[PDB]
Amino acid sequence: AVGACVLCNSQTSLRCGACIRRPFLCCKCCYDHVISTSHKLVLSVNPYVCNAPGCDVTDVTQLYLGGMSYYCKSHKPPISFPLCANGQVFGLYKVTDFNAIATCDWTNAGDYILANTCTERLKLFAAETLKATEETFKLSYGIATVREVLSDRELHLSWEVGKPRPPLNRNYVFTGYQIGEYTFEKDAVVYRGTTTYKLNVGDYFVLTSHTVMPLSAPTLVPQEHYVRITGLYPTLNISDEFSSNVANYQKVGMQKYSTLQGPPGTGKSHFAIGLALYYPSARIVYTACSHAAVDALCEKALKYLPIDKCSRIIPARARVECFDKFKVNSTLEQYVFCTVNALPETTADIVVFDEISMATNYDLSVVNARLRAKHYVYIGDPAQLPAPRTLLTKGTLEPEYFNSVCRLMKTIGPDMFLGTCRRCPAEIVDTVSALVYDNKLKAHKDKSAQCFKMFYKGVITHDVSSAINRPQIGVVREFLTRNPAWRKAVFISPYNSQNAVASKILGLPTQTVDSSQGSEYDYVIFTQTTETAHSCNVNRFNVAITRAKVGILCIMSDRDLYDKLQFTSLEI
Numbered sequence: 001a002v003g004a005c006v007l008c009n010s011q012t013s014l015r016c017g018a019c020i021r022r023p024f025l026c027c028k029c030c031y032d033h034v035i036s037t038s039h040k041l042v043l044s045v046n047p048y049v050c051n052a053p054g055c056d057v058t059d060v061t062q063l064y065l066g067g068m069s070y071y072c073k074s075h076k077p078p079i080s081f082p083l084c085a086n087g088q089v090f091g092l093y094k095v096t097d098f099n100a101i102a103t104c105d106w107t108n109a110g111d112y113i114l115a116n117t118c119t120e121r122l123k124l125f126a127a128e129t130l131k132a133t134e135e136t137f138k139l140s141y142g143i144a145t146v147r148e149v150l151s152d153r154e155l156h157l158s159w160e161v162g163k164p165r166p167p168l169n170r171n172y173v174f175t176g177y178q179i180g181e182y183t184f185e186k187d188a189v190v191y192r193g194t195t196t197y198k199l200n201v202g203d204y205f206v207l208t209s210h211t212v213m214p215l216s217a218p219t220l221v222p223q224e225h226y227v228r229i230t231g232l233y234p235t236l237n238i239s240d241e242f243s244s245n246v247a248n249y250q251k252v253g254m255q256k257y258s259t260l261q262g263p264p265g266t267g268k269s270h271f272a273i274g275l276a277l278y279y280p281s282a283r284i285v286y287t288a289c290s291h292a293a294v295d296a297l298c299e300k301a302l303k304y305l306p307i308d309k310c311s312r313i314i315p316a317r318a319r320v321e322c323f324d325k326f327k328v329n330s331t332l333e334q335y336v337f338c339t340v341n342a343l344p345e346t347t348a349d350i351v352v353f354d355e356i357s358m359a360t361n362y363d364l365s366v367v368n369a370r371l372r373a374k375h376y377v378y379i380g381d382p383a384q385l386p387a388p389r390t391l392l393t394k395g396t397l398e399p400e401y402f403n404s405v406c407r408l409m410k411t412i413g414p415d416m417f418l419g420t421c422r423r424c425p426a427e428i429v430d431t432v433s434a435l436v437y438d439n440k441l442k443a444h445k446d447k448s449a450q451c452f453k454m455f456y457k458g459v460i461t462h463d464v465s466s467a468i469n470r471p472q473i474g475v476v477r478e479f480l481t482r483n484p485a486w487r488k489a490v491f492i493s494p495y496n497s498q499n500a501v502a503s504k505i506l507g508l509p510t511q512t513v514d515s516s517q518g519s520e521y522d523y524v525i526f527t528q529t530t531e532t533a534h535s536c537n538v539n540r541f542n543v544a545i546t547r548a549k550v551g552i553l554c555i556m557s558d559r560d561l562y563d564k565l566q567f568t569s570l571e572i
């Protein structure tokens with residue numbers, strides 16, 4: 001029961017029993033917490049509760065020290081000192097932001113704003129608290145029981161009454177009963193088990209609620225600037241392909257950590273892999289939150305780095321299929337590609353943390369705790385999508401509040417900025433450069449004259465809350481007949497239910513804006529589906545239209561974003 005204060009690091013035995021994470025609070029900070037919040041239970045070796053038999057006084061403000069035991073006003077002996085007095089709570093070794101983090105329900109944007117603008121120790125307390133709150137919320141949903149099996153990819157479900165039903169998308173991964181993880185897509189539903197198993201009627205599925213481990217390491221280590229490249233040995237034979245990044249690679253070796261803002265198709269993975277060719281003897285750990293982000297780094301490394309010095313770290317509880325071309329689980333290899341949650345306890349000369357807009361402060365801290373590195377490089381784009389905040393329902397989360405790295409990129413600017421988009425037709429580059437990049441993103445490609453926009457509100461229907469716009473899909477169908485080259489397009493929308501409908505009607509491969517991030521396609525057909533905060537979100541809009549290498553058709557619901565698209569308008 002001996003530890004350090006979360007607010008001022010002062011030593012104490014005084015924890016808070018009312019906080020879900022039980023934080024240690026010193027005498028002054030414990031007082032300022034109990035006297036300003038509903039939190040009145042204070043912990044130590046023995047709790048601050050009335051020692052009198054059958055007494056339920058647990059409020060520290062109503063308790064006193066009577067010799068060596070604690071009693072309320074009704075049971076205290078004549079010679080007794082109040083536990084709360086002179087701005088302190090009695091304890092051994094004798095805050096407005098801490099209070100708000102400790103007592104919020106995490107459903108408001110303002111809660112995440114505070115969790116990212118607070119001191120470093122409060123950022124870890126907010127991250128631990130938020131994650132535990134998100135996990136305790138998983139218990140609220142209702143069990144789905146297999147009532148009948150139709151085919152190898154379709155079934156019918158029986159839901160638990162009294163408990164709400166979770167949205168059926170690839171975002172929520174169920175746990176079948178321990179017969180492997182399972183996913184669902186919309187009474188006939190589509191079943192996708194991570195393990196091929198003959199779906200048993202009667203067997204139940206439940207959401208994976210995991211124990212939230214405490215955070216020790218900061219989200220960002222303290223910054224260090226050096227006069228020379230430190231612990232890294234550069235080449236004087238750096239391939240012309242990577243010469244554009246030489247000054248930035250040198251910046252990487254001259255700072256403890258560095259941030260790289262790379263808009264879509266500006267060369268983030270090329271920069272990340274080229275850093276290995278610039279410091280050829282450096283041990284590099286390549287990390288990201290998702291298996292897809294890690295796999296995209298493996299694909300680029302397969303092209304430039306020796307396959308014998310690479311290893312893809314895969315957790316024993318293999319959830320989805322990932323990169324098979326490197327030797328699996330050899331932690332000792334020079335190049336290690338691994339998701340944040342599967343990182344081993346190891347050291348590195350450089351740690352590259354990619355798709356940083358998708359990281360949370362919990363992820364930032366975990367990386368600093370498992371990896372001890374000479375240099376840390378954070379690659380991503382605050383103008384792209386953040387990790388979904390399942391508890392957040394009120395207010396919008398701005399990019400400067402996604403995590404510590406994004407906060408820095410949006411306030412002091414990033415250390416490095418990749419300014420030339422090599423992927424997209426100029427119509428798309430010009431639109432997103434003006435929309436989210438302050439006119440600093442330049443187009444390498446010419447205009448393709450294959451970027452179209454149509455303003456069509458259609459009809460909005462809902463599959464629970466996930467939206468569908470059948471008339472917008474009908475407009476796509478009509479366009480496809482007149483433009484058969486577009487037969488090869490990927491259909492993108494902000495909603496899985498819109499995508500399920502488009503899949504059956506158009507036969508195009510489908511992708512939500514959020515699952516399309518990091519991917520690129522020659523042709524993209526995007527239907528906005530609705531005018532909601534979700535479908536009008538400028539970061540989501542940015543990702544959506546920057547997936548296209550050659551052409552894009554945007555069927556829009558919002559006049560604002562439609563007018564901003566620098567595309568040829570279509571009629572019908």
Ligand SMILES: [Zn+2]
Pocket residue numbers: 005006007008009010025026027028029030
């Ligand atoms: Zn304190």
Ligand SMILES: [Zn+2]
Pocket residue numbers: 016017018019033039102
């Ligand atoms: Zn508390």
Ligand SMILES: [Zn+2]
Pocket residue numbers: 050051052055056057071072073074075
């Ligand atoms: Zn009492």
